[PDB]
C-alpha cells in the first residue's frame, strides 16, 4: 500500500572491525527495492523529534517510497564501540553505506540528509566514493572542522561552540547510561552550569584545564584545546580538499548567523562546476530557525520552510536517485533570504554574478574610539594619515553580542550592538546616512593596518546596520590571531611597534542597508566568548594564567600610505 | 518483535452522518489487541514535528507496546466535511473512539495527549462517557472556549488570539488546496501581513469588519466577534460545568505565561477529587517552551523536559490504561516550576496546602502615575483616602507587553515593563526593597474601589517582580470589562463617578520575590492587542468606529474606606 510503512528498531549493522552500530529502519510497504537516504546521528536515533525541525518533514519521504535509515554513530546510545568526534565517522559511513546496498530493500540509489552533525557526516560519507551514494543534502555543516566549528579562518578558538557542545554530549552520555553511575547526577547539574553560564566556564584560566569535561571526554582537551594549529590532527579529519575531486550532488543549506555559514557556502563553491549543487541561507542562527530575534524580526517568510524544503529535498533526490531528470525543474539554484528587504530571492550563482568587491576605507576626524568618535566609512581613499589606538585588556574583553554564536546566548544574531557603543576599545567607523539603498551580498573581509605594542594580538571587525531609530544590528563578523595573519599552519610572531597589513574573513552576509540606515563597521581586538582571548604573550593561550596576561596597545592605521577598509560585495539591481 | 511498528495512512472512519475522518495508525507488532492513544488535530496529522515537540517523544509510546492514533479533524487536509472551530468535536471524538474500540488491534483501553487545540479536544472527548477511555493528557488547553483563549474571566476579547489564529487556520486551508484558487497567492500574504502586525490588524476600527478574516472563516464573526457575552453559544461549546461529574483521570500541563494557564489549572481543580489527576506547570508561553526571553533566563532545567514528560506520560498510562498499580509510584501529583528561585518543585496539591491569601494594599503619597510616582504596597491598611487619576484614550492604549500573549509577540512572557514606565495612565505600587524572601505561588487576584467618568471602561492589573539591575519582570495578569464586573452573562452598565468594587482576576504564577527586589503591581485600562480596547461608550465594542469611541477620566480610590488591594497567595516554607 502506497503511503504505509514499517519501522524496525535497533537493526545491528557489523562495522569492518566487527563493532556494531545500531540503526532504525523506515520502509515503504513496497513490492521491490526503493532508494534510500541515511541519516547519522550522535544524539539518539530514537529521538526524531529533537533535529527533524531543524530539516525537513522526512516521513513524507517514506509515504512516498524512500526508506530512511537513521543510525546512532559510534559509541552513543544503542551503538556499541567507543565515541570519539570526527575520528570514525568517515570509515563508519563507508561500511553502513556498503550494507544498505546489499538489503533485498535497496534498489542502489542512497542518498543522506540532516542538520549539523547529521550534515557533516555526509561529507564525510561522501568522500569514500562509493558508488551507490548518488546525492547528500548537507545542512548548516562543514568539511572543514577546523575553520568551523572548533576553530576558524582567523585561527582563534570558538570557545563557546566547545564548551557548549561538550556540555550537551556530555549530559547525553550521563543519559545514554552502561549503568546508572554514582557521580552521573552531580556531573549532570555541572554540565547544566556550563551551559547556563558558557562565559563563566570560559573565562577559567588555564583554559586547558577542565576536570569535568576533559574527564567526560578527552577530546576537548587532547584534540581541540592542544591543537591551535591548523596541524595534521586537523587536516585528518577535514574533507574540503577532497570536495574538488568529487562528483556528488549536494543541496546545501545555510543560515546568516550560523556558526557553519562560513564553511557551508565554501563547500557549495568546491562542488558547484563538478555536480548539481543547491543552495539555500536564510537568516537563522543554528539554534533559533525561527525569524524572530530580541531586536530584529525577519518576518514570518523568514520562519525555517520546513514544508518548502521538504519539497525540494523530494524534487532533488527524485531527480539524483530516482532518475527523474525533469524533477528539479523552475528550482533556482540558489536561493537567498536577502535581509533589510527581508525577501527571499533565486539566484543563478553563489558568488552572485556582477559582484563589485568594493572598498570602503576607514577615515574621519579625530579618534574613532565609542560610537560618538569621529569614525567614517567612505569609497574615497581617507586624505590624512591618522592612527586609533585603544588598549585591549584580557580581564576585560568585549563581550560577544549575536553573530554566529552557537551555545552562548547563540538565539539572537542579529544583536542590537549599542550595550558595547560606549566602550574604548571598539572602534566605530560608518558611512553618511543613505539616501539610497546598498545591496551586500557575497562574501565580506577587511585589511586593515594593524600594530600593537605586543608580540601576539587578535584583530575583530564586525559589520552592522545602524537603524534609523537607533537599533545597531549585527550582520557578519570575524577575528584574525595575529600570529596566524599568514598561516593557520605555521604561526610566527610580530615585532612591536611594526605595522602589518593583515585581511580579517568575515564571513558572508545578504543585507540591503536601506535609505535612512548607515553602513558601520566595528574594530576591535576581542569577541568574548565567540572566541577565546589572547593573551598577548605570544605563548600557548589556553594554556596561560590570566594574572601571566599582558595588555596591549593596539593601533589601526588609515590614510593615503595605509589605506584599511572593508571590502564589501555590492550588488545593484 | 517488541519495539517495532507499521504505520498506516489515511484510513477513513465514518462519524455518525457518514462523513469521514482520515487517521493514521502507528501499531505496534504484537500478537495481540494493545491499548490506543488517540490524537485530534487540525494541523495536519501527516506534519507531526510541528506539535510533537511542545508534548512528547510519543513514538516511545509504539515502541513500547501502545498504538497510536492521529486523526484530521472534520474538513481539514484528508478529512471529509466542513471545517467549524470545536463545535463538531464532541460528537466526532465519540464517534472516532467507538470506532478505536471495534477494532481487532484496540484492547478496550483508550487515552489521549496533546497540546492547545489537541488538548482542548481530549475534554470534549472526555464529555462523551465511552467507557473505553481511561484517560487523558490536555496540555496548555482549556474547557472553557470563553474564558480561554477567545475572550477571559474578565470579559474582554482576546483579539490577538483570535486574529493570530484565524490567519494560521486560513494558511492552513490554502494549503488544505480542493485545488488552488486564482485568489490562493494573494491572500496567503496577506494572511502573513496579519501574522507579522496582529496589534495592526487588531486596530482596524469596526473590529468586526473583516474582509478577508470573515470570508475566509466566517465563525471569526459569526461566533467570537458577535458574541462578546458569555452566552449560550459559548455554554453550547464548554465543558466545564460537566467536568465536576466525570471520573477520567487526566495529566494536565500549564505555562505560567501561557495564555490557557487559568482555564489549564482550573480543570486540575475540577477533576482531581474523582480520578487521579496530575499536574505540570512550567515558566512557558504558548509558541516559546526554550526557558529563555529577551530579558528573562530560567536555566536550561527549564526548557520543556520532553524526554521526562515522555516518561510521565507512558508511566501515567500504564497506571490507567495497563492496570499497573504501582505506575506511578513516586510520581509527584503536582509539579511547578517556581521562578525566582529558578527551580522544579513537587506539591502535594493545587492551590498548595497552607497558602496565606494576602492582601497588599495601595497606598503612598501623591500620585502613583509612572513607575517614579509615589505608589506603595503594604501589608498594612491605607492610612489616608486617596485617589489616583488617568486619562484613558481608546485611540492610544498600554501596549501589550509579555504576559500570556499568543500570536502578538507571544515568545516574551516575562517581559521587562520598563518601556511603559513613563506613561501616565500606568499606575505604579511596590513594595520596600524585601529583605527576606516571598514566594507567591496559587492563583492571584485584585479588589480594587474605582470611577470612571464614562458608562463602560476596563480596569487592568498586573503583577511584577522589580529586579535590583532595574529589570521589571511581568507575571501575571488580568482585565475587568466593566459591564461584566458581576456576571459575563447578563452585563449592565455602571453609573459615571460612582465609586464600585471590582475583582480582577489575575490567572496564577509562582514566583519568589528574593531580597533586593520589590513586588510591584500596575494598574491601567488597556492592554492592547492582548484585549481589546473598551470604547468607553457602552455599546457593542466591536462594531465602533475608533473616531466614535470616548476618553475615560479613571480613578482608582485607596485608603481606609475604599481598601484597594492585590491579594497574593503567600507560601513560607
Ligand atoms: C551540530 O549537531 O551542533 C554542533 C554545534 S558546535 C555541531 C558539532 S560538529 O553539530
Ligand atoms: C492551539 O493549537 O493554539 C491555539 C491558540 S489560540 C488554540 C486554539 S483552541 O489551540
Ligand atoms: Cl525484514
Ligand atoms: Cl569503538
Ligand atoms: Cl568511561
Ligand atoms: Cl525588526
Ligand atoms: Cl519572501
Ligand atoms: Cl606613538
Ligand atoms: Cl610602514
Ligand atoms: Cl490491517
Ligand atoms: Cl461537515
Ligand atoms: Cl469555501
Ligand atoms: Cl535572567
Ligand atoms: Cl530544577
Ligand atoms: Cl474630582
Ligand atoms: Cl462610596
Same mark, same amino acid.
Given at each position: ?9 535497533? #537493526? ?95 534498489? *542502489? ?9 547529521? +550534515? ?10 562509493? +558508488? ?269 553580542? *549575536? ?117 558601520? #563597521? ?15 604573550? *605570544? ?35
Amino acid at each position: 500500500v502506497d503511503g504505509n510503512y514499517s519501522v524496525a528498531s535497533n #537493526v545491528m549493522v557489523p562495522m569492518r572491525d566487527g563493532v556494531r552500530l545500531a540503526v532504525d529502519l523506515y520502509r515503504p510497504d513496497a513490492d521491490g527495492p526503493v532508494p534510500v537516504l541515511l541519516v547519522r546521528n550522535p544524539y539518539d536515533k530514537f529521538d526524531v523529534f529533537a533535529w527533524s525541525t531543524q530539516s525537513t518533514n522526512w516521513l513524507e519521504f517514506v509515504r512516498d517510497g524512500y526508506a530512511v535509515v537513521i543510525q546512532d554513530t559510534r559509541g552513543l546510545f544503542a551503538s556499541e564501540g567507543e565515541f570519539v568526534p570526527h575520528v570514525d565517522d568517515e570509515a563508519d559511513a563507508e561500511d553502513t553505506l556498503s550494507w544498505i546496498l546489499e538489503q533485498a530493500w535497496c534498489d *542502489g540509489n542512497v542518498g543522506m540528509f540532516g542538520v549539523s552533525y547529521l +550534515g557533516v557526516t555526509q561529507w564525510q560519507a561522501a568522500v569514500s566514493g562509493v +558508488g551507490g551514494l548518488k546525492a547528500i543534502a548537507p545542512s548548516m555543516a562543514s568539511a572543514d572542522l577546523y575553520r568551523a566549528p572548533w576553530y576558524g579562518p582567523g585561527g582563534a578558538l570558538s570557545v563557546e561552540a566547545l564548551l557548549g557542545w561538550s556540555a550537551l554530549i556530555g549530559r547525553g552520555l550521563i543519559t545514554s547510561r552502561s549503568d546508572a553511575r554514582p557521580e552521573d547526577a552531580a556531573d549532570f547539574v555541572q554540565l547544566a552550569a556550563i551551559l547556563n553560564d558558557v562565559a563563566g566556564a570560559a573565562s577559567v584560566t588555564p583554559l586547558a584545564e577542565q576536570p569535568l569535561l576533559g574527564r567526560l571526554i578527552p577530546w576537548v582537551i587532547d584534540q581541540v584545546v592542544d591543537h591551535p594549529d591548523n596541524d595534521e590532527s586537523w587536516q585528518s579529519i577535514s574533507l574540503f580538499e577532497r570536495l574538488g575531486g568529487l562528483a556528488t550532488p549536494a543541496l546545501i543549506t545555510a543560515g546568516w548567523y550560523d556558526g557553519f555559514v562560513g564553511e557551508s557556502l565554501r563547500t557549495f563553491v568546491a562542488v558547484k562546476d563538478n555536480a548539481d549543487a543547491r543552495l539555500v541561507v536564510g537568516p537563522w542562527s543554528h539554534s533559533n530557525l525561527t525569524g524572530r530575534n530580541a531586536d530584529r524580526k525577519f518576518g514570518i517568510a523568514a520562519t525555517y520552510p520546513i514544508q518548502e524544503a521538504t519539497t525540494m529535498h523530494k524534487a532533488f533526490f527524485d531527480r539524483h536517485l530516482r532518475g527523474e531528470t525533469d524533477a528539479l525543474a523552475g528550482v533556482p539554484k540558489v536561493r537567498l533570504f536577502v535581509m533589510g528587504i527581508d525577501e527571499w530571492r533565486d539566484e543563478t550563482d553563489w558568488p552572485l554574478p556582477d559582484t563589485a568587491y568594493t572598498p570602503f576605507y576607514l577615515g574621519g576626524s579625530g579618534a574613532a574610539n565609542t560610537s560618538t568618535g569621529g569614525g567614517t566609512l567612505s569609497t574615497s581613499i581617507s586624505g590624512t594619515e591618522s592612527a586609533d589606538t585603544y588598549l585591549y585588556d584580557p580581564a576585560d574583553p568585549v563581550p560577544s553580542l *549575536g553573530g554566529t554564536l552557537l551555545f552562548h546566548n547563540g538565539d539572537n544574531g542579529p544583536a542590537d550592538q549599542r550595550p558595547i557603543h560606549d566602550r574604548d576599545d571598539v572602534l566605530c567607523y560608518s558611512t553618511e546616512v543613505l539616501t539610497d539603498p546598498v545591496e551586500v551580498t557575497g562574501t565580506v573581509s577587511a585589511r586593515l593596518f594593524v600594530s600593537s605594542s605586543a608580540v601576539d594580538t587578535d584583530f575583530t571587525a564586525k559589520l552592522v546596520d545602524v537603524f534609523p531609530d537607533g537599533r545597531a544590528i549585527a550582520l557578519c563578523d570575524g577575528i584574525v590571531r595575529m600570529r596566524y595573519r599568514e598561516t593557520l599552519v605555521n604561526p610566527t610572531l610580530i615585532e612591536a611597534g611594526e605595522i602589518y597589513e593583515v585581511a580579517i574573513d568575515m564571513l558572508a552576509t545578504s543585507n540591503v542597508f536601506l535609505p535612512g540606515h548607515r553602513i558601520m #563597521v566595528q574594530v576591535s581586538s576581542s569577541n568574548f566568548p565567540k572566541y577565546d582571548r589572547n593573551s598577548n604573550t *605570544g605563548g600557548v593561550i589556553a594554556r596561560e594564567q590570566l594574572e601571566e596576561m599582558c595588555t596591549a596597545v593596539n593601533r589601526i592605521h588609515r590614510g593615503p600610505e595605509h589605506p584599511s577598509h572593508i571590502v564589501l560585495p555590492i550588488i545593484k539591481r
